[PDB]
Amino acid sequence: GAMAIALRDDEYDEWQDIIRDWRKEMTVQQFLDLKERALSGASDPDSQRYNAWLELRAKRLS
C-alpha cells in the first residue's frame, strides 16, 4: 500500500477529468509533473496546451 493518493476532492475530479479528455488512464504523478511545469511558467507545448485545457474546462459548465 502506502504512497496512497492524497489529492483533494476537487483535484481528484480534475485528474479523472483529464483522463476522460485523453480517454486513456494516466498516473497522478504525471498530472502533478505536468501542472508543476505548466504553472512554473513552462513553455513546453504540453504546458500551454494544459493551461488551455483549464480554459476549455472553464468553458465547459455542468
From Swiss-Prot:
Residue numbers of O-(5'-phospho-RNA)-tyrosine PTMs: 12
PTM entry text: VPg is uridylylated by the polymerase and is covalently attached to the 5'-end of the polyadenylated genomic and subgenomic RNAs. This uridylylated form acts as a nucleotide-peptide primer for the polymerase.
Top-rank lineage group of the source organism: Viruses
Cysteine-cysteine disulfides = none
Q: What does this protein do?
A: Viral genome-linked protein is covalently linked to the 5'-end of the positive-strand, negative-strand genomic RNAs and subgenomic RNA. Acts as a genome-linked replication primer. May recruit ribosome to viral RNA thereby promoting viral proteins translation. Interacts with host translation initiation complex to allow the translation of viral proteins.
Q: What is known of its domains?
A: Contains a compact core domain in the N-terminus half that is composed of a three-helix bundle.
Name of the protein this chain belongs to: Viral genome-linked protein
- Per the UniProt record, the source organism is Porcine enteric sapovirus (isolate Swine/United States/Cowden/1980)
- Which lineage ranks, top first, belong to the organism behind this chain? Viruses, Riboviria, Orthornavirae, Pisuviricota, Pisoniviricetes
